[PDB]
Amino acid sequence: MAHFKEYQVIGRRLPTESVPEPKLFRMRIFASNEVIAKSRYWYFLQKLHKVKKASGEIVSINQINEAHPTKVKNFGVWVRYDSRSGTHNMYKEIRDVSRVAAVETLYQDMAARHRARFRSIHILKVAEIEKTADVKRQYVKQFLTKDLKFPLPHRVQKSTKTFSYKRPSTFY
């Protein structure tokens, strides 16, 4: 929906006292707020084992905050989506600073280079690559080098007044 939050979520499958005390399953999912964090939790487990909303519940719901929201690091990520014709399972390597800032790009990314929309993607496991040289996609590896630092051409500047008397240059 929006710039997402990130959650844990834990459900229980309501105890019939004939066979009581069930096993307390757990996800760790991505969502814009808490009400869609709940309403995607059943969707991961309806495709796993025979639970639905009139068999279980949410027993608690917690907005997980990320441990180090300023450190840079490489995110490895496994992605399943549905295409126009056939489903696939992928491996991107996003480069960001925190976990919900990581897959903020990837919903917006794979909507571009594949046109896989939001309702037809299953972001399954989002690991991290903490050390260099085993980032498999080498286009983010070439960033991770020694004093690589670059110029940036064609600096347009802003416009507030509709006219101008200066005919600007773009030195930068």
Partner: peptide, 15 residues
């Protein structure tokens, strides 16, 4: 061909 290239230590201006 002068430039302004961004090494660690560029002071910037928040516009």
């Amino acid at each position: 061909s002068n430039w302004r290239l961004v090494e660690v230590g560029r002071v910037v201006l928040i516009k």
